[PDB]
């Protein structure tokens, strides 16, 4: 999911105060962690996923795969924390509309 900068900046601000709800280990993007990311997105829409790897390229590939498989938007990668957003029918999270 691709959102505008405006949209991402808004989401980044709502995210500051959140603590991560999923830790993705150095073993990588397994089906089990993918399923947990799905549940977290369904429950909160905007979440923080801590990614264990220290290797930039690897972190990148993992993030790209999460985006493609889940349809969520990569709001921003901050250090080891990936901020992801995907709406649910309930629309829990706010957003500027374009």
Swiss-Prot record:
Keywords on record: RNA-binding
SMART domains: CRS1_YhbY
Pfam families: CRS1_YhbY (PF01985)
Gene Ontology molecular-function annotations: RNA binding
Domain CRM: 1-97
Transmembrane portions of the chain: none
PANTHER family per record: RNA-BINDING PROTEIN YHBY
Protein name as annotated: RNA-binding protein YhbY
Protein source organism: Escherichia coli O157:H7
């Amino acid at each position: 999911m691709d959102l505008s900068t405006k949209q991402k900046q808004h989401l980044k601000g709502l995210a500051h105060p959140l603590k991560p709800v999923v830790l993705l280990g150095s073993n990588g993007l397994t089906e089990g962690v993918l399923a947990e990311i799905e549940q977290a997105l369904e429950h909160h829409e905007l979440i923080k996923v801590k990614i264990a790897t220290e290797d930039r390229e690897t972190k990148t590939l993992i993030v790209e795969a999460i985006v493609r498989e889940t349809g969520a938007c990569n709001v921003q990668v901050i250090g080891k924390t990936l901020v992801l957003y995907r709406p649910t029918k309930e629309r829990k999270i706010s957003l500027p509309l374009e």
